Protein backbone atom coordinates (compact mmCIF):
# COMPACT_ATOMS: atom_id res chain seq x y z
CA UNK A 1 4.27 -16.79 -36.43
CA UNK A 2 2.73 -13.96 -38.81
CA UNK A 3 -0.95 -14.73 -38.77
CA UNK A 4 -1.76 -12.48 -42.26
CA UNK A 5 -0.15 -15.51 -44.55
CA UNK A 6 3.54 -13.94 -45.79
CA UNK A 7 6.00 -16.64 -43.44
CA UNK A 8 9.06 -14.96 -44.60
CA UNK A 9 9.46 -11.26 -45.22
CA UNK A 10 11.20 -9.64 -47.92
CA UNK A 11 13.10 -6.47 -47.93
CA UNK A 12 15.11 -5.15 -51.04
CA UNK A 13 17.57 -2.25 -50.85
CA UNK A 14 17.95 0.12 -53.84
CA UNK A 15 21.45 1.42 -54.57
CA UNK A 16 21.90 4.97 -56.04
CA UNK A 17 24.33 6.43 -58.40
CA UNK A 18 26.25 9.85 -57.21
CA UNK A 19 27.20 10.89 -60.35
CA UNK A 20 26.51 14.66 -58.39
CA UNK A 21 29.84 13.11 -56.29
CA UNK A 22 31.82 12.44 -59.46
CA UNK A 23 31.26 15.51 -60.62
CA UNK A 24 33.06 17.06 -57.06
CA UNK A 25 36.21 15.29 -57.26
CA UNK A 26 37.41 16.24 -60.79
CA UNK A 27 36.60 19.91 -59.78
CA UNK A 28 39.96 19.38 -56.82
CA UNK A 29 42.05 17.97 -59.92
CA UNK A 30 41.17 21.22 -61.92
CA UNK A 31 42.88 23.09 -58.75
CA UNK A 32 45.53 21.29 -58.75
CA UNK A 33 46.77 21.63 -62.00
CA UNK A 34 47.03 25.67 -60.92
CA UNK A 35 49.74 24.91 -58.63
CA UNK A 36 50.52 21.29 -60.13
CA UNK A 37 51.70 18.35 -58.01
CA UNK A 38 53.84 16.24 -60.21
CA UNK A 39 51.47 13.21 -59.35
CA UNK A 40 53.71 10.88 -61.62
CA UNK A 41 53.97 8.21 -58.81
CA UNK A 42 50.40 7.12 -59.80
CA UNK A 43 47.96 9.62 -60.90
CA UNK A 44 44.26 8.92 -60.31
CA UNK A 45 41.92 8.93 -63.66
CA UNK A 46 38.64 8.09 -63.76
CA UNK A 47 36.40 7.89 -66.78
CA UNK A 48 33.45 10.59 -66.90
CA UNK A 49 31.50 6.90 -67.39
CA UNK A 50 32.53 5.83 -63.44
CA UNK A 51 29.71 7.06 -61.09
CA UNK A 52 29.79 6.00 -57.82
CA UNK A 53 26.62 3.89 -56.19
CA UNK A 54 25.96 3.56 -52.25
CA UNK A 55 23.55 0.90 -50.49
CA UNK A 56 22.96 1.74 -46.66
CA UNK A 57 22.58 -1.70 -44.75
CA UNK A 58 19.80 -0.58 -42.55
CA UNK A 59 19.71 -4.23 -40.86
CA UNK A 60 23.02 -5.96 -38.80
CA UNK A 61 22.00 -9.82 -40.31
CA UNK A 62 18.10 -10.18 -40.01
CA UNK A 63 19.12 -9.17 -44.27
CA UNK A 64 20.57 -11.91 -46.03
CA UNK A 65 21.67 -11.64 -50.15
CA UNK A 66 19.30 -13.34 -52.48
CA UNK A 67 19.92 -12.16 -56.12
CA UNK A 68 21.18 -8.85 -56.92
CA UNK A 69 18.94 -7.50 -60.11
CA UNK A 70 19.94 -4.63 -61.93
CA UNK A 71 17.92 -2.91 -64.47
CA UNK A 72 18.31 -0.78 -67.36
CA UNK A 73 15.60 1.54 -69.54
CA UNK A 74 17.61 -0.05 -72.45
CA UNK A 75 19.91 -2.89 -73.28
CA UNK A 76 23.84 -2.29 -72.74
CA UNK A 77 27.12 -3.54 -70.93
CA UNK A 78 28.23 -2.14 -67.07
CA UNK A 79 31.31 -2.97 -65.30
CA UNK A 80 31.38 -3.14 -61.18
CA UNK A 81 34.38 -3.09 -59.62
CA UNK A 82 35.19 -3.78 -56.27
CA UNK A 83 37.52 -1.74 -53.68
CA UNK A 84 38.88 -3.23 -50.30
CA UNK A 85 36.97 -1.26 -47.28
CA UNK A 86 41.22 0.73 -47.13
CA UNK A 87 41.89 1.23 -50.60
CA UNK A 88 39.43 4.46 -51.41
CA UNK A 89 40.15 6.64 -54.31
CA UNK A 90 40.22 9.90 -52.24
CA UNK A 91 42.50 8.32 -49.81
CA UNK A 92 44.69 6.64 -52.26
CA UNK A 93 45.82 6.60 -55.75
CA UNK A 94 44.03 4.97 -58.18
CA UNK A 95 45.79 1.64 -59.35
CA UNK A 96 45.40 -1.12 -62.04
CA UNK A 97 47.44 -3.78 -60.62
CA UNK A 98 46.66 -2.88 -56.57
CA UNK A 99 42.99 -3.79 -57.30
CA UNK A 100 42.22 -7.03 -55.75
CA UNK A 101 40.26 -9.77 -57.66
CA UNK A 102 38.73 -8.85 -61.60
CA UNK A 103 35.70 -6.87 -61.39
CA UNK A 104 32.37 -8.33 -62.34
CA UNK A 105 30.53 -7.82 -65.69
CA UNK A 106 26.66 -7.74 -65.99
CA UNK A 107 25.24 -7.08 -69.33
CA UNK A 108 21.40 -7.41 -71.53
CA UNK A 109 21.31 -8.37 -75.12
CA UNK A 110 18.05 -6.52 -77.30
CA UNK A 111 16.93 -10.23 -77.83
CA UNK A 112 17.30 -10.78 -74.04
CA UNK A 113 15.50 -9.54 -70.88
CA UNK A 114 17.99 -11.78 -68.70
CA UNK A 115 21.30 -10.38 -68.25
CA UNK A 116 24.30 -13.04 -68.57
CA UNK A 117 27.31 -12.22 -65.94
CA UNK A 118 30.35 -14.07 -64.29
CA UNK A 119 28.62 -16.01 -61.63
CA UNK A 120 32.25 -17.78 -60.27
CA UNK A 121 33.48 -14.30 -59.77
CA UNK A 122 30.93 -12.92 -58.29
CA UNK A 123 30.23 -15.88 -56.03
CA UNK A 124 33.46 -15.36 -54.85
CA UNK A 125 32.80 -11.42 -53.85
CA UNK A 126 29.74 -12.56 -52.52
CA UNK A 127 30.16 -13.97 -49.11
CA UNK A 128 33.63 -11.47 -48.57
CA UNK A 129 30.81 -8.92 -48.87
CA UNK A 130 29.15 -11.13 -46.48
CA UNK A 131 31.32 -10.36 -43.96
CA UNK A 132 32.71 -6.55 -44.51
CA UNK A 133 28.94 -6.06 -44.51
CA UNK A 134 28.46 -6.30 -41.24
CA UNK A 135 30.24 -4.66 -39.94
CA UNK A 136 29.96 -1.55 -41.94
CA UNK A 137 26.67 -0.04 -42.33
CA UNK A 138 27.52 1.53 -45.68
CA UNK A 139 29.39 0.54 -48.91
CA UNK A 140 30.50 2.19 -52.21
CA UNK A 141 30.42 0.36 -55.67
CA UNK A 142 32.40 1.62 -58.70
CA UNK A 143 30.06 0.72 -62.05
CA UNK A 144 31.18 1.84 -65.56
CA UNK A 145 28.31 3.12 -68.30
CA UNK A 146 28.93 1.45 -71.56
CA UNK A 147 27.66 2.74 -74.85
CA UNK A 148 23.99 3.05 -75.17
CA UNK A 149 22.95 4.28 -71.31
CA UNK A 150 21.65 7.29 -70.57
CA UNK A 151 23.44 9.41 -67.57
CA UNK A 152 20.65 8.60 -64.81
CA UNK A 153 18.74 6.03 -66.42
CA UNK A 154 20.50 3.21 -64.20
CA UNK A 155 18.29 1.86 -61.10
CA UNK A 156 19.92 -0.88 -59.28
CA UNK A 157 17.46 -2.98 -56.86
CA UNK A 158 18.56 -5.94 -55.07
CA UNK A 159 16.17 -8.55 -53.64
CA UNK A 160 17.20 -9.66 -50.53
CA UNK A 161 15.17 -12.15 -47.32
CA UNK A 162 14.45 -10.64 -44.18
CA UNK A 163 13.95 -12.90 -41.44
C-alpha cells in the first residue's frame, strides 16, 4: 500500500562492458606462444570486437524481466551470444558447434530509433535465464561491435518491475 501514488516500483539494472577484461586474456595467449602449447584440439579466438558485459542481480525474484533496451550513440548491428553457466571461455575452449542455441541479433537502422531483433529466439533464452538467474547473483554476456560503434560508446539498460 504505497501512500505517495507509484503502486508498482520499477528498478532497471545497467550492464557494463569489460573491454579492460578482454584486454587481460589475450595478454596470457601472448605468453604462451613463448613456450607454445600446440592448442590444435580447439584453440580459443576471440575477435578484438567481443567485450564482455556483467549485470549483478542485486534482488533473488522481487525483479522480474520486462524489456531489455539497449542503446547506442549511433545506429549499427551487435551480436549477443549466450554461454551455459559451465561452458566459460577461461575454463574451456572456445567452440562453434558446442554453443548451445543461435545467439540473438539486435540492431538500429539511421531511419529507425526502434531496433528490430529475433523475438522467438530470444523468448526462448528468456525464461532459461529466468531460472539460472536465480540462482546466480551474477552473469556474463558475450556482445560483438559491428561496424560503425565506437569502443565504449555502448550502454546497455534493461527495464525491469520490482514488486
Amino acid at each position: 500500500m504505497a501512500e505517495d501514488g507509484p503502486q508498482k516500483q520499477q528498478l532497471d539494472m545497467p550492464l557494463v562492458l569489460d573491454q579492460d577484461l578482454t584486454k587481460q586474456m589475450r595478454l596470457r595467449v601472448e605468453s604462451l606462444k613463448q613456450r607454445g602449447e600446440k592448442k590444435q584440439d580447439g584453440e580459443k579466438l576471440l575477435r578484438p570486437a567481443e567485450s564482455v558485459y556483467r549485470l549483478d542481480f542485486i534482488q533473488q525474484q522481487k525483479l522480474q524481466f520486462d524489456h531489455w533496451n539497449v542503446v547506442l550513440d549511433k545506429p549499427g548491428k551487435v551480436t549477443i551470444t549466450g554461454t551455459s553457466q559451465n561452458w566459460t571461455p577461461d575454463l574451456t575452449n572456445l567452440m562453434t558447434r558446442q554453443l548451445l542455441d543461435p545467439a540473438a541479433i539486435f540492431w538500429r537502422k539511421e531511419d529507425s530509433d526502434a531496433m528490430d531483433w529475433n523475438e522467438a529466439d530470444a523468448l526462448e533464452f528468456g525464461e532459461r535465464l529466468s531460472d539460472l538467474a536465480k540462482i546466480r547473483k551474477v552473469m556474463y554476456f558475450l556482445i560483438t561491435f559491428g561496424e560503425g560503434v565506437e569502443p565504449a560508446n555502448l550502454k546497455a539498460s534493461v527495464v525491469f518491475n520490482q514488486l
